[PDB]
Amino acid sequence: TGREILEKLERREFTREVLKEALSINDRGFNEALFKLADEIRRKYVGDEVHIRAIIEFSNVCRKNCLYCGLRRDNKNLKRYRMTPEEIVERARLAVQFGAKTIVLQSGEDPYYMPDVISDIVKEIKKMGVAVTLSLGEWPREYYEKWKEAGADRYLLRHETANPVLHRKLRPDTSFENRLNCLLTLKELGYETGAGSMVGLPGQTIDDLVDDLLFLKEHDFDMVGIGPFIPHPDTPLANEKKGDFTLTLKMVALTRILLPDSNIPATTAMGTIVPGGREITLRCGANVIMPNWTPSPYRQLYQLYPGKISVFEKDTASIPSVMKMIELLGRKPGRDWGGRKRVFET
C-alpha cells in the first residue's frame, strides 16, 4: 500500500525495499502524496527561497566520448567554440549585475583551459563577491586543488549512474570508480559537492535508480542534479527512448526526502521534456534554478541533448524570466549565496 510507504518515508525508514516500492507504485494518488511530502519537506528545511545559479557554458570542446552526449568527441556535426577568458569574466560580471549570486562555469572536458586559465578566471569572478561553481569534468587532484586555492566554492560532477557496469559502457573513457574518486577528492578539498544522475538511460533499471538514491544518501552531497535522459540524434543513443518525466520527478522528490537540507535544481532537461517541467519540479522538492547565461552565438552550439529551451530568446532573458517564475510560484529569490545550510538531526 502506498499509504504504508508514505508512512515509512515520513518516519525516515529508508530501506532499499521502501525506495524500490516508492519507485514501482504508479498510482496517481500515491504519486501526488509523495510530491506533496517532498514539497513540504523542502519548505520546512530549505524554505521558500529559490537560489539562482547563472550558468556560462564557455566551451563545447570535449576530449571524452560519452555515448549519451551531444558534445562527445566523435560528433563531427557540431561547430566547436571557445570563449576567451575576457569574454567569460565579462559575461559573469553581467550576470552579477543582473542579480546572480552564484556563477556556474561549465564546459566540455576541454584541455585548453586546464588548469591555469580556469584559475585566472575564477580569481577575477571571485572579486565580484559571488559564489563560483565549477562543472568541468574529471581532472587530476592537482587541478582541483589549484581551483580551490583560486577561490572556487563548489563543484558539480554528476555521478551519472551508480551501476559501474552501465557507467563504463556509457562512458568508455573512464569508470564509476574514477568518478567517485573525483567526488571524494572534491569533498576532501572542501568544495560544496554536487552529484546526481540521469533517469531513463538505456539499460538502466528501477533497481539502478534505487542504488542512485542510496549512493546520494550515503555520500551526503550538498547538491543533487537529476534529469531525464534525452536522446541526441548525433550520438549512438539517438534511437533510444527518452526518460520518463514522472519517474524523474519521483527521483527528485525522493532525493529531497532523503537529503532534506540539500540544494536540488529544477533542471533545464526537466523543462525540455515537458513544457513547464522546471516549475513542476520546484513544487516537488527542488529549490534551485539555473538560468542559461551563455551568450549568443555560442549558446545554440551547447546542446548536450536537443530541444534545449532558452535558445531562441535574447541572451539576457533567462535571469528575468526565472525571477518572474519564482514570483508566480509564490516563492522568493535567494538573498545570499545559497550555500548548504545543514540541519543536523538524528
Ligand SMILES: C[C@H](CCC(=O)NCCC[N+](C)(C)CCCS(=O)(=O)[O-])[C@H]1CC[C@H]2[C@@H]3[C@H](O)C[C@@H]4C[C@H](O)CC[C@]4(C)[C@H]3C[C@H](O)[C@]12C
Ligand atoms: C492545479 C491542479 C489542479 C487543481 C484543481 O484545479 N483542482 C480543482 C479546483 C480546486 N480549487 C480549490 C481551485 C477550487 C475547488 C472548487 S471547484 O468548484 O472548482 O471544484 C493540481 C492538481 C494536482 C496538483 C499537484 C499534485 O497535488 C502533486 C504536487 C503536490 C505539490 O505539493 C505541489 C505540486 C503538485 C505537482 C500539485 C500542483 C497543483 O496543485 C496540481 C497540479
Ligand SMILES: C[C@H](CCC(=O)NCCC[N+](C)(C)CCCS(=O)(=O)[O-])[C@H]1CC[C@H]2[C@@H]3[C@H](O)C[C@@H]4C[C@H](O)CC[C@]4(C)[C@H]3C[C@H](O)[C@]12C
Ligand atoms: C545592469 C543594469 C544597469 C545597472 C547595474 O549595473 N546594476 C548593477 C546592480 C547590481 N545588483 C543586482 C547586485 C544590485 C542589487 C540591488 S538590490 O536592491 O536588488 O539588492 C540594471 C538596470 C535595471 C536592472 C533590472 C531592473 O532593476 C529590473 C530587474 C530587477 C531584478 O531584481 C533583477 C533583474 C532586473 C531585470 C534588473 C537587472 C539589472 O540589474 C538591470 C538591467
Ligand SMILES: C[C@H]1O[C@@H](n2cnc3c(N)ncnc32)[C@H](O)[C@@H]1O
Ligand atoms: C551536464 C549533465 O548533462 C547531462 N546530460 C548529458 N547528456 C544528456 C542527454 N543526452 N540527456 C540528458 N542529460 C544529459 C549529464 O548528466 C551531464 O552530467
Ligand SMILES: C[C@@]1(C(=O)O)N[C@H](C(=O)O)C[Se]1
Ligand atoms: C546545470 C545542470 C545541473 O543539474 O546542475 N542542469 C543541466 C540540464 O538539465 O540541462 C545539465 Se547539468
Ligand code: MET
Ligand atoms: C557538459 S557535461 C558537464 C560537464 C562535464 N563535462 C561533466 O561531464 O561532468
Ligand SMILES: [Cl-]
Ligand atoms: Cl551551485
